[PDB]
Amino acid sequence: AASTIPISQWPSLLYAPPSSPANPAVEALPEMQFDDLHYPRQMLLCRGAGYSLEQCNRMAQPDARVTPENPAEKLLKEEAVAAIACLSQREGGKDEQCRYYIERMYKLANKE
Amino acid sequence: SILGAEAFPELLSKVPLNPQMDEDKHFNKYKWGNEPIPVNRRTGSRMNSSIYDNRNHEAVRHPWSTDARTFHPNDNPEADRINTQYSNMVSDSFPEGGFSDAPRFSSNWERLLAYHHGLYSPEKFNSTTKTADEIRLAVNDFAAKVHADDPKNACKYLMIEEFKCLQSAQARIDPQGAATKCVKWFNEWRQCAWDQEKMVKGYNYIEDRRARKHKPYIGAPDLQYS
Amino acid sequence: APHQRAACEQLHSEYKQCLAKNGRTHFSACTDFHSKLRACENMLGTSYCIDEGINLMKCTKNPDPSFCAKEFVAMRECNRPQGPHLVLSSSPSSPPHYELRPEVKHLYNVDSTDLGSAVAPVRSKEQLDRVADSLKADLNLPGYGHIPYKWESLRPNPGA
Amino acid sequence: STSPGLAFANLTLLLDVPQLPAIWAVNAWRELNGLFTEMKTLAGTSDLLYPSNRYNPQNEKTNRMGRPRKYNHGEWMFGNSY
Amino acid sequence: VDAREMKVDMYEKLFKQAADLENPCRMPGVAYLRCLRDTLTETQSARRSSCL
Amino acid sequence: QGIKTVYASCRYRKLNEREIISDRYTWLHERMLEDEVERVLLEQVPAGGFDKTRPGLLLGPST
Amino acid sequence: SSPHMDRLLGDLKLLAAYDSAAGWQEPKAMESAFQSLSWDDADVLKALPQYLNCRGEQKRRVDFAYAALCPRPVDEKDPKQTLMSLWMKARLFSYDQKHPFVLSPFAA
Amino acid sequence: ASPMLFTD
């Protein structure tokens, strides 16, 4: 059923992957970013402005141009906190002990 | 005082990180078992590929001594390849840990000379495969930089596509193999460049009158093309 | 004389404006300005491509089989600030040649200033033979003219 | 009259002889468009017109491919830039 | 204005041939020249505020 | 069709002439713009020209 | 004697196991991984509501570190993924508010 | 998304 993906189809595989029990956001895969040039560029700009290494290191800040945050963390806050409480109390939800909260979250997120 | 007590939940709870670990430690938590990745696909050396090469399917020769056992791609794969992710697909054409052809130089001048003559880049020889996430990050950064360079460019996505294909084909370690895949997008970009220039600078030509037998049959439709 | 220089720049701009207003079909109206522009040229050591522009305008309405190419390149090389880089050599010889000034030779990828004749060659069996023999000699390929199979016939060259 | 062996010809006729009026109308429309284009050319144009081309968008402010002309804001001593 | 457009095009061609996409100064240079293209039909005094 | 072809041949000849001359006029226009730009640039050259012997920018020591 | 380090490495191993089991279609293995994911850590539990309300430099540091370790964007619909992301972020927030992160290569 | 992800 799962047939081989040739090498020519890998660029399409990266941005339209097959279905899994744990899929990513295919619509947001073009939005995942992490700049390895952020701090070097910052340092170059500051040293061109005229600062010393200590001043540059004090002014350095981490990149804001990274992958956006999951909106579920702000929308389903209380539900997620309750689920985490249930997991911490019931040993990770063994034998279906956090099914209540997990099903409420799933329904809220999916809507049939 | 034991070392790493809280650090092996995979061992305490019988959780396998992969079907190979499952098979080894006999956790038996993978319903479909494990087909082991053979050693010729787990490691090996770079080889020649083309049939128009005389030393085809032979290991690449370097100035240094190197194991001549080659990486063998999966040529007769099984029908069901349950994991069709990039992680499992890349193993059919490259080894995840990189090739076994890397040098340990006894001196710096050997390294210098190999580089000067075009026979060594650590990018190529001391390196692993790139993960899908890394590839996507690189591609998205390049696309952002190109969009900033010029939004109103028609060859934009073609350039982005050749970059994407090089990254996916692991051009750091197989540049010749990746160029073989990506030169099509380079050619399309080359075409788009002229197609854009001729639109910017109005360039056209005198078309001749219609041919007597433009249509093969009188009852045939002559679909009009710009 | 900076007053006169600025006055001449104003005059040149006025001439260009008048010429643009009239167009390149009606250009004999602006023969007014040559009187003063030639004096500007003789005074400042300047050129304003007057004769070349007029000749080009005259030619393009009654064009040559060359389609006025020599006029075009003459105008392009006149309009340069520091002077023409490329010129047409004057000769008693029949064929004219393109020539390059020496002081700009380092800007061009050339061995000499002679860029060849300004007219194409004339068709000749002998010139074609010469060129083909030279190319054959330079190539030095054993296998040219070899015929591994020829259609069997009383004719020496079957078909062609 | 007819027969099964003549199904090719029957279908071809039924489907094609109604199109002949349309074909002649298309030819006439093309000839008339060519006539009007040639009359326009005789009248005169700023930029040329390609007769046997599908579309001719070129004007004082437009290229021969429908884009704006580069370097067309000012005026030039030799007149039009084309 | 036509000669200004030509000068900016020469600048852009030269700078894009000189600096590749890996270069850090490429994006700022291209941005500055794009602002010049935006503000060709202006004076230097008005152009400074925009290209700064 | 023969009359049409004769007329079209004449028109195409004239059109080829006009097209050639138009392209050459566009070329000349662009080159004249380049000449104006160069004429303006030569004003920014310092008095006495460039010191072609030395580097314009000295960007490090030589000890 | 090294609980923070040990639990960090365990969390990372369990995340890798979850991803592998998802790729290989193994609900038993991935649910084992989810259940074994150190949900009984009082420090991370206490730092969870602090992370959920932090803002500015600390949040940007923790976001940078989380995008380093796990740059892939999880599906907004899968609560198990969402929760594991939240747990890892809370762990990093706790570590940062105990000993802040220094992410630049330039430092002295 | 990009135009080359389209195949159909």
G24 and B9 within 8 Å at the Cβ level: the answer is: no
- Whether residue B59 contacts residue B93, with contact meaning beta carbons closer than 8 Å, is answered with no
- Report CB contact under 8 Å: B206, D52: yes
Q: Which residues are CB-contacts of A57 (< 8 A; sequence separation ≥ 6)? A: G104, G106, G107, G108
Give the span between the Cα atoms of D25 and D31, in whole angstroms: 10
Helices then strands, each counted (H, E), chain A: 6, 0
Residues of chain A with C-beta less than 8 angstroms from the C-beta of G107: 57
Cα separation of B63 and C151, whole Å? 54
Element (DSSP H or E) covering residue B111: helix B108-117
Contacts of D75 in chain E (CB under 8 A): none
Compute the nearest-CA separation of B12 from chain A (Å).
14
DSSP assignment letter at C132 = H
Q: Touching C: which chains, 3+ CB pairs < 8 A?
A: D, F
A11: which chain H residues are within 8 Å (Cβ-Cβ)? 4
Antiparallel, parallel or unpaired: β C86-88 and C97-100: antiparallel
Q: What is the distance in angstroms between the Cα of A64 and the nearest Cα belonging to chain H? A: 23
Q: Does E25 touch chain D (CB under 8 A)?
A: no
**Residue A85, C-beta contacts closer than 8 angstroms, at least 6 positions apart:** G45
**CB under 8 Å to G44, separation ≥6 — which residues?**
G38, G87, G90, G91, G94
Specify whether the CB–CB gap between E6 and D71 falls below 8 A. Answer: yes
Task: List all residues of chain A from 22 to 41 with a beta carbon under 8 Å from chain H.
Answer: 30
Distance (Å, whole) CA D77 – CA C27: 10
Residue A88, burial from CB neighbour count under 10 angstroms (0-12, 13-18, 19+): buried
Q: Which residues of D touch F29 (CB under 8 A)?
A: 71, 76, 78, 81
- Could you tell me which chains touch chain A, where touching means 3 or more CB pairs under 8 A? B, E, G, H
- Among partner residues D41, D48, D81, which is closest to F25 by beta-carbon distance? D81
Residue G88 tokens, joined: 């890892």
Give the technique used to solve this structure.
cryo-EM
CA distance G77 to G83: 11
Instruction: Report d(CA B181, CA B165) in Å as an integer.
Output: 7
Mutation target vs A (from B14, B74, B137; most A CBs, 10 A cutoff): B137
With vertex at residue B64, the alpha carbon angle to CA B59 and CA B68, rounded to the nearest 5 degrees, is 25
**What residue type is assigned to position C19 of the chain?**
L
- Judge contact between E1 and E41, C-beta under 8 A: yes
Task: Estimate to the nearest angstrom the gap between the alpha carbon of C102 and the chain centroid.
Answer: 18
Q: What is the resolution of this structure in A?
A: 4.8
The token pair that represents F26 in the structure block: 């566009």
Q: Determine the Cα–Cα distance for residues A63 and F7; give it in Å rounded to an integer.
A: 70
Candidates G5, G6, G25; nearest CB to B82: G25
The reply to whether F31 touches chain C by the CB within 8 Å rule is yes
Give the helix ranges, DSSP H, for D2-56: 7-16, 19-43
Name which of C17, C21, C24 is nearest D78 (Cβ-Cβ). C24
Give chain F's end-to-end CA distance (angstroms, integer): 86
Pair B218, B176: CB distance under 8 Å: no
Residue of B nearest to F27 (CA): B201
- Residue B28 to residue B34: CA distance in whole angstroms: 10
Vertex B88, ends G63 and A23: CA angle to 5°? 45
Q: Is C24 on the interface with D (CB under 8 A)?
A: yes
Nearest-by-CA chain B residue for A37: B141
The residue written with tokens 């099509």 in the block is: B184
Q: Do chains E and H touch (3 or more CB pairs under 8 A)?
A: no
| Helix axes of G3-23 and G79-98: crossing angle, nearest 10 degrees | 160
Q: Per-residue DSSP letters for C2-58?
A: HHHHHHHHHHHHHHHHHHHHH-SSS-GGGGGTHHHHHHHHHHHT----HHHHHHHHH
